[PDB]
């Protein structure tokens, strides 16, 4: 279908995988990072049935499957499952076999080297990709947003990275990596919905809660005041339709879950929240850097699409920041989808063609080569 | 009785074939109904919520 | 034949009854359903029509 050896681009998180091709401004398909497996003994004969289901197949057949995520806190722990995801992601929907096209995969700046090494090894030895690159997610977000400078908050399902970049340079001493993420927010919601009389303990139930969160939840500009009314009156409650026709009505839990981003103690996390994490990265940068980072809080990844988050993050930093200074958040509608787009931008830059590891250098050096070549 | 039976069986089978078609019409009708309700619900609610959140413009 | 006729006649009646019961529940379905069908889309449609204009500010 393609008339050029454009790189294929994927952003593989602990949640979902966004995929498309280099040179576009959008992914063409999205898959959950899920491989599902039946937990029941077959009784009928001749009904097909796979050993495992991938992506959207895993969710469509989930009624009897246990659903596992191969990626946790930013890294691949199960790469056999990622190979099935990548075949499906690159060839079944995008219709491109990596054998004839370069591939770009992404990681956080401090993501364990073992993960970039496996991403490189898998695409070269299983998919025979002619070339590889593993990209920094923060770089990609800044390209997509039109910035060279800012604090990148990649606040998704796995890990919040929080890295300051200035004039295209990393400022690693000011990175505030935090093990606070969207997967934990979901777990908290499952526990507080349990308190309301709706226990969720199985995979189907877990996926429902993640659906409740995505459709009903928000952070709120002012949590304590929003909670004071939501916890006192039905006027701030919203219902959700459960798959079997039953419904659940949710009050302050609707925003208390997302609030864990600002109050991590809700899940037993030793943290002051994502806005102090952001603030400290600015604080630790040089004094003639700080002004540009205060003016550029960059939103990427999941959770950045909660109602009240763009306004809340600018307000929370303003509250920590010195007066006189202008604090600004970069949070357009195309917010968060900035990391996939950046992968496309980077892969297709003329100034980045020399950055691709070819399947020449790869076999001479082995997968450890990514640590020497990507950045 | 055989002719009456063939006629009664014709009526029972006619009607059974017809009721089958009607049952199908109901299944389709209910799916259409659900589509009307679901689309209506989705539209009325997506607007109540779109306007309740999108209030500042 | 008498029993088959009684059963077939009974079934002719039950099947035809089911046919006129379903034709009626279907009409009573569809008719009430078209009301939804004609008003859910017209309400939502006119809501969307109005939205193009509601948003012209």
């Amino acid at each position: 279908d393609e008339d050029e050896t454009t790189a294929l681009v994927c952003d593989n998180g602990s949640g979902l995988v966004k995929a498309g091709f280099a040179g576009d401004d959008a992914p063409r398909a999205v898959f959950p990072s899920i491989v599902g497996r039946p937990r029941h003994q077959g009784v009928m004969v001749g009904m097909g049935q796979k050993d495992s289901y991938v992506g959207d197949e895993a969710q469509s057949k989930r009624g009897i499957l246990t659903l596992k995520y191969p990626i946790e806190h930013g890294i691949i722990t199960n790469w056999d499952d990622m190979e099935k995801i990548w075949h499906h992601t690159f060839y079944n929907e995008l219709r491109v076999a990596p054998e004839e096209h370069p591939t770009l995969l992404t990681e956080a700046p401090l993501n364990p080297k073992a993960n970039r090494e496996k991403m490189t090894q898998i695409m070269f030895e299983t998919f025979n990709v002619p070339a590889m690159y593993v990209a920094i997610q923060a770089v990609l977000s800044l390209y997509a947003s039109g910035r060279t400078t800012g604090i990148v908050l990649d606040s998704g399902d796995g890990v919040t990275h929080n890295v300051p970049i200035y004039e295209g340079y990393a400022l690693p001493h000011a990175i505030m990596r935090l093990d606070l993420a969207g997967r934990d927010l979901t777990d908290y919601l499952m526990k507080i919905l349990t308190e309301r009389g709706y226990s969720f303990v199985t995979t189907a139930e877990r996926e429902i809660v993640r659906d409740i969160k995505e459709k009903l939840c928000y952070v709120a500009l002012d949590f304590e005041n929003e909670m004071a009314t939501a916890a006192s009156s039905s006027s701030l409650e919203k219902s959700y339709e459960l798959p079997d026709g039953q419904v659940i009505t949710i009050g302050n839990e609707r925003f208390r879950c997302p609030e864990t981003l600002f109050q991590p103690s809700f899940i037993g996390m030793e943290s002051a929240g994502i806005h102090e994490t952001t603030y400290n990265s600015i604080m630790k940068c040089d004094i003639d850097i700080r002004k540009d980072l205060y003016a550029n809080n960059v939103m990427s990844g999941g959770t950045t699409m909660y109602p009240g988050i763009a306004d809340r993050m600018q307000k929370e930093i303003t509250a920590l920041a010195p007066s006189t200074m202008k604090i600004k958040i970069i949070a357009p509608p195309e917010r968060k989808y900035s990391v996939w787009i950046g992968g496309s931008i980077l892969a297709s830059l003329s100034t980045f063609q020399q950055m691709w590891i070819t399947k020449q250098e790869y076999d001479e050096a082995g997968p450890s080569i990514v640590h020497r070549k990507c950045f | 009785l055989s002719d009456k039976l063939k006629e009664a069986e014709t009526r029972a089978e006619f009607a059974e074939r017809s009721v089958t078609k009607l049952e199908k019409s109901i299944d389709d009708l209910e799916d259409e109904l659900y589509a009307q309700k679901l689309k209506y619900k989705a539209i009325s609610e997506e607007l109540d919520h779109a306007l309740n959140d999108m209030t500042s413009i | 034949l008498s029993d088959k006729l009684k059963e077939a006649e009974t079934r002719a009646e039950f099947a035809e009854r089911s046919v006129t019961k379903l034709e009626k529940s279907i009409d009573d379905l569809e008719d009430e359903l078209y009301a939804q069908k004609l008003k859910y889309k017209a309400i939502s449609e006119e809501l969307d029509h109005a939205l193009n204009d509601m948003t012209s500010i």
Partner: peptide
């Protein structure tokens, strides 16, 4: 309200930018 979602972004951004300009234009002294 798709019309609003985008008009909302347009006006919030345009007024915020215009306001930032109004504030700077005077604040620069």
């Amino acid at each position: 309200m798709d019309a609003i979602k985008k008009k909302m972004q347009m006006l919030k951004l345009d007024k915020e930018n215009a306001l930032d300009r109004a504030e700077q234009a005077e604040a620069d002294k």
